[PDB]
Design a protein around this nucleic acid. Sequence first.
RNA 1: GCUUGAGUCUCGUAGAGGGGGGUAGAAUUCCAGGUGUAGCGGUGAAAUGCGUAGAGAUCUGGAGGAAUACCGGUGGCGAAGGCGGCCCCCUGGACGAAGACUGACGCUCAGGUGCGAAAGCGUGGGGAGCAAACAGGAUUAGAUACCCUGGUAGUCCACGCCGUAAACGAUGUCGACUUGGAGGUUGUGCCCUUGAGGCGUGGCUUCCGGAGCUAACGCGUUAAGUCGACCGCCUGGGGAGUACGGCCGCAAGGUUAAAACUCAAAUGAAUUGACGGGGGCCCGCACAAGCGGUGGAGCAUGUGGUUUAAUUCGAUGCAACGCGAAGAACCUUACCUGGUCUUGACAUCCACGGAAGUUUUCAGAGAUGAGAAUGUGCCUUCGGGAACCGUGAGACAGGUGCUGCAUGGCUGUCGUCAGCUCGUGUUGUGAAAUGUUGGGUUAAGUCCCGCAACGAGCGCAACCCUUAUCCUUUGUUGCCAGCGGUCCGGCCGGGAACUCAAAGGAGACUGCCAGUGAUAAACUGGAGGAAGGUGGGGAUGACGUCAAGUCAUCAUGGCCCUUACGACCAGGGCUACACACGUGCUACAAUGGCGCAUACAAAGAGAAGCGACCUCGCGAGAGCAAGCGGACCUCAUAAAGUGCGUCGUAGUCCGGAUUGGAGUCUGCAACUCGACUCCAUGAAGUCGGAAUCGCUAGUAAUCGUGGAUCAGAAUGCCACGGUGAAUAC
Lengths: 206, 151, 101
Amino acid sequence: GQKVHPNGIRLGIVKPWNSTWFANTKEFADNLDSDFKVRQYLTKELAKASVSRIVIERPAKSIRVTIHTARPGIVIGKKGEDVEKLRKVVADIAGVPAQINIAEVRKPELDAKLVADSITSQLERRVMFRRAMKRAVQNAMRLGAKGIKVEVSGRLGGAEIARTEWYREGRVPLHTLRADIDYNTSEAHTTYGVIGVKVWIFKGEI
Amino acid sequence: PRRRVIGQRKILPDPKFGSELLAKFVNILMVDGKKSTAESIVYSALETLAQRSGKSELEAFEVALENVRPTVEVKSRRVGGSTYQVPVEVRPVRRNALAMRWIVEAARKRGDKSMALRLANELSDAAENKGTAVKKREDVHRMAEANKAFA
Amino acid sequence: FDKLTKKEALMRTRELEKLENSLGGIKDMGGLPDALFVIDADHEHIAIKEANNLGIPVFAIVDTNSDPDGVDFVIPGNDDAIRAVTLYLGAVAATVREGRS
RNA sequence: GCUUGAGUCUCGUAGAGGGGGGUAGAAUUCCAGGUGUAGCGGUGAAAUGCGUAGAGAUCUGGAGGAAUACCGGUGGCGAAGGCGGCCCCCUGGACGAAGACUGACGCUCAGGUGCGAAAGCGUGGGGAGCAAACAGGAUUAGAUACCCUGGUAGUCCACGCCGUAAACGAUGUCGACUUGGAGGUUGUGCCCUUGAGGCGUGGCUUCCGGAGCUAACGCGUUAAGUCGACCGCCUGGGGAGUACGGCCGCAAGGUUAAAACUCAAAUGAAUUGACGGGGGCCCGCACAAGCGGUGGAGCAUGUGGUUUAAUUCGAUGCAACGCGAAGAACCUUACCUGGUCUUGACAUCCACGGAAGUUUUCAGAGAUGAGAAUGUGCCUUCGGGAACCGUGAGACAGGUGCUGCAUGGCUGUCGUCAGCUCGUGUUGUGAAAUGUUGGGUUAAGUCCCGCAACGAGCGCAACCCUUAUCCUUUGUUGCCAGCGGUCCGGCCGGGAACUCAAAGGAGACUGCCAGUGAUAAACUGGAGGAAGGUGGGGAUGACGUCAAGUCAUCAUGGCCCUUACGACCAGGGCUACACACGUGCUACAAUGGCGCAUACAAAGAGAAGCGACCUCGCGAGAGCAAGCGGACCUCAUAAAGUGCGUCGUAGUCCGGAUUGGAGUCUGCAACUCGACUCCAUGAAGUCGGAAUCGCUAGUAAUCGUGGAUCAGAAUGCCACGGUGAAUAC
């Protein structure tokens, strides 16, 4: 087990943080756990909506949750009853007056959360993994994407030993720190157990 | 030393006599990074050495150290599958480095009161070359003299 | 060319010397050619071997050490005399530059 | 009949072809003698052995046996085995030149016959060296061996036997045809032989290669190519070239030659890797050069074992063993002993009742039971809903239970080692190869050059953080150069220069110079500069390896318990101790111990917190209590250092373990089982056996300080600064 998380080593360099509140030591743990609850809830209740990121920020006793998603229409719905429902329950969880926004992730096959969730969904619909991976690499390289690597792992095809079998195309410069590597990871709970899907997407060199 | 040939770092000379030779002598004597203590011992011991021998400071030191410098020393080879102790000519910096190491080590062996008396008596015993460091030099020279047959 | 670096600009210019002297004449071709004219058959056996591999007519001036491999139009001549190859290429370049005109 | 096959004759040539006889010169051994004297010989080192009865060395004379240096050459001759001084005698074959003659007389060959290395056998000689056996000495765990010192058969001759060898070009003989190159050796012809030349033509032979063949390796006009003639032999490995029988042999044995049984392979050549006590080049505290440790002592902490009611579980070469655990009194806790609960401590959905909540008492170890007030927090053709608590059935909940060899995720490691690959192309029947190798260079598959490769990816480098210098901005709480007075303290007015703070820039790239180098990469040296050649340090850990670690952080497939392997409680244990190991701390002292005075830090933490000042206590601390959510206040005095005095080589004024007494604090609670203080006690230990470890420069060593976890508990861990080496051939 030996590679650094390629979001974490780029946190001040190119990648931003998904939480951008300041807090002293008295409320740092409380704000942090409140963020675990709103991302847990808001991740479970938008499983069909293809959600990429949820960014929390707290401007002066009020949360401001931004849902980067690929299907904004299914998040908002017929006149946005679903949004006001979600800020009602996020205001229930965080205990502050909640705002909520939706940012449309166009080009959803270049986002690693959406790619890993895609391949994970296909693996738990019992399709063969080489199609899922290989289709994901092809259609991601089709639109921009100066590199992509996907990597499934663990008891693939229902075996009794676990393999990995990664694929990559293009250039994925993972030790370069100015590389805009969009990396994310999902787990596929199949009837044989968990199958881990990692995906790195190299977008640009700065 | 596998690849890297090196330089060497320049030591500051002695703050009383301007002698880098004696500065390396207080570094050979120093333990636990305590340089003030070691230079106090060297100033006291060489001061009573200059008072006893009546010569001067660092020419009494230079005579007492001239009697303990090795000429040639043995050295292992392991070339033909055998252990040889070949005699080899000592470089001058190594020559007086070994001189000081033997004086200091023999002075730590002695049984007098203070370190300045142990080392003042060891340098005085090396001025008429009868101390312990001269027995170390004669021992080295018996090893390189017995094994002269390897050059 | 002067943009952003001197060292990398020097690096890139000597990439133009290397790519210019290796891919010199062929850089404006844009196809693979309809014939091949080699000046020594044994010294340039690689090119003859490939043009035979691809069905390209090879026109070689062989010497007495060379081999008529797949040279479609062999010419028994002298490969390493500059008088001979300047006369020789003079005739060939003379007959090339008559198309329908 | 005929001559192109085969053979005969003439003339020469070269030759270690054979058999018999003779002789010569070097050398070894022995014998006799001269000189001469303490070793010689031998080995990795030794010893056995020889030697003052005179060895070895050296000179002279003699005897004897075997072999024949130099020439000597992938040179020659022979059917093969094989044949090596020189000379003579007897003798076989080959080859060449011209001509003559015979005229198919030829080729192969089962049985048969002959020759046939070495060892061996028989009879008789010989016997210098060498040397199976043998003996002694060593080496070794053993050493019936390798090594040493001796040493018999044998090796040598004559005659007879044997009849085999990796008797091998592992290639039967004879003949024909089929591109080349460089040699060697031995003939012969022609041309100015104008020389150690030029042109041919035969015989034998060596190396490389074309087509072709070949499983490949390779063979390649001397075929393993293309054909013909005849012979010999093969039919999976083992058993087994063995047994029985026959023939041969003096014998040893040779030859001919099975079967039962047993295996599903045995084999050849080549490929990729790994390995080698193979070779070349290269690196790293790997060794060397040094400095300080560990192993010895006492204690701390972890582990194995033992004990136990339990001593919870996991980690076990490196890469487990102050590891998970950044902190076991109760809690944590998973374990043990008892007491208890069963839709449950934690969920979701029902149905009924009641707002919940708040202070009480008794029993017991807590929760269960018995009472008093408060109950309506807002809506309901009233059948209820919001929140919370009991009760009942469930579907379930729960599991630190098992499986890391079913998994994910995360981690260690080889290793921050420089490598690992791919596309297209080409080569090979193919596994695969090339690229990636080669000449240089580099820290680096770094970079240049070359090249059946051309390119590309992951890795290296750079981008990132920090540190080292300068500039700009802002100047509080931070700073005080110049000013004014000053309670002499940045203390105040004030100043924004400086330290500094933090943001933004500059800077270092072999950029410049000289030399060496394929005029290339680069290397060596020099200047400037705070810094010089990836400046220092960190982060960053390629494809994969160990079915490495974790199911006990979490998630998770399957299995299992579900009045129990789930849950609650009190007490205990994880702290046990004949022992063994790991990692640390403190020591053994005078480069020090103690007492007094006195100087110089950096980095941090802080509200259920850090807690001044002042008073009390010898002290740990206690009381009152400012200031500070913090460059402002507190933790908080840095200590080694220095200057004085004392101690004086003593188990001592070293060392502090252990133990008794008296306490402080935290915490419901210090008995098991805290931390600290005071008085008393004052072990072991005088530098650590075999062995072993860390470190290459602000490093090791040594000295303190802070933090996380935490109510309290570090000698551990993570950080910070002070002093500050030695050495690298």
